[PDB]
Paper text:
Comparison of the structure with the wt-aIF2γ-GDP-Mg2+ structure shows the transition between switch ON and switch OFF states. In the GDP-bound structure, the magnesium ion is still bound but three water molecules and one oxygen of the β phosphate define the equatorial plane, whereas another water molecule and the hydroxyl group of T23 are in apical positions with respect to Mg2+. Changes of the coordination of the magnesium ion are correlated to the structural change following the loss of the γ-phosphate previously termed the loaded-spring mechanism. Overall, the conformation of wt-aIF2γ−GDPNP differs from that of wt-aIF2γ-GDP by a rotation of domains II-III with respect to domain I by ca. 14°. This rotation is partly due to the movement of switch 2 helix, and to the subsequent remodeling of its interaction network with β17 and the following loop of domain III. In addition, transition of switch 1 position from ON to OFF causes release of interactions between domains I and II involving the strictly conserved R219 residue.
In eukaryotic and archaeal cells, the initiator tRNA carrier is the e/aIF2 heterotrimer. In its GTP-bound form, this factor specifically binds Met-tRNAiMet and brings it to the initiation complex. The γ subunit forms the core of the heterotrimer and contains the GTP-binding pocket. α and β are bound to γ but do not interact together. We were able to observe GTP hydrolysis by aIF2 or by its isolated γ subunit.
Author numbering: 2 to 38, 48 to 415
Write the structure that this text describes.
Amino acid sequence: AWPKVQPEVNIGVVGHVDHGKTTLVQAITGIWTSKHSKLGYAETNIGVCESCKKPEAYVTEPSCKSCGSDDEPKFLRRISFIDAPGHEVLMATMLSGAALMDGAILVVAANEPFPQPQTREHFVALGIIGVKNLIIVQNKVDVVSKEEALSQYRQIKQFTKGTWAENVPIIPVSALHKINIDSLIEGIEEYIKTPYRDLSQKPVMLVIRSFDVNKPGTQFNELKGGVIGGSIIQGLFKVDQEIKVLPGLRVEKQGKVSYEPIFTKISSIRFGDEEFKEAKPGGLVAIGTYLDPSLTKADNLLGSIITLADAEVPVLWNIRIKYNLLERVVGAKEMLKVDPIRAKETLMLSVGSSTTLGIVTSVKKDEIEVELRRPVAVWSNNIRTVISRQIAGRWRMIGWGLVEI
Ligand SMILES: Nc1nc2c(ncn2[C@@H]2O[C@H](COP(=O)(O)OP(=O)(O)O)[C@@H](O)[C@H]2O)c(=O)[nH]1
Ligand SMILES: [Mg+2]
């Protein structure tokens, strides 16, 4: 019997619309992520049939029938996938990507010219947020000749050559007909390994959703505290731990604007449909709390950072960022130059995957100083920052950096 454990790794699935992201996640997990009426999420166990040859030995359920054996397969690990509905939701979650994803799959349709517009954008975005454990999946090989597939494969290798992605593998599949999916599972095991995690690091969690789960007319004894949804960035949380929500509540007192942390306690921990006593990075987690549900209703806490109640975590209104920029971005028409950062500019800053607006107060060499609309939690040195600028009416990623404390 396979164990019941949390996912230990989260994989973002990106690529141009209709290239087959959701079909691919279904082929792997058996789950259709967009059966909802907001992020698609799906988990699967991964195993291997010890006496079978690879890649067919790799399986996603406890059976070896797919490789002609009656044996029970060995359990390797549980993994999960993030699959967004549409470009705008996807790009929005990419701003939190570093916290959410241990790796990524870029889906490329074999029957469309490469690269498609969102293909280019998603690939650039992955570099910016630093999620570079990448697999490129060449999908829909069932509707082109082997020659056409081979030709596109070589275009892609030419594209990645000279970039950070030069050594990224390309795995051809048909998500629809489940062809060569076992090769992809094998590739996930090789190229998106579970990271080394130092579980003695101070616990930090990003909040991506918050809920009031009480139906109307719920009686007193059946009421629940506010529920928080998110991803554990580092460390380990436990049931019954005291925690605080950062920066907290915005307050106007003694002639100043300030933020007061929200203190509470973890009542329960859930991954998918199982309850746990602890929670580590990997997977999206649901945290039950003792919060008044009015504080969590309608994603009120979205973008909060959660730590233990006594954590020494600075919450800063002004930050210094050491950064680098893109040379150009793709305009709807054609290439737009990325202008240097100038004082007084308004930027969107994603700091350790929590996002706010800010005004540049100083620029020198490769550092900026920014005054933020609300303050950000900074729990270590070299917290990665995404810098975005409004270009032609839209926020665009233009750079990345590290927060210097
Ligand atoms: N022929 C073929 N069609 C596919 C394959 N994978 C997906 N499709 C089709 O492509 C369309 C878009 O797929 P979908 O998973 O919704 O793409 P997404 O927008 O990237 O999530 C659907 O009609 C799928 O059935 C494949 O491997 N072969
Ligand atoms: Mg989809």
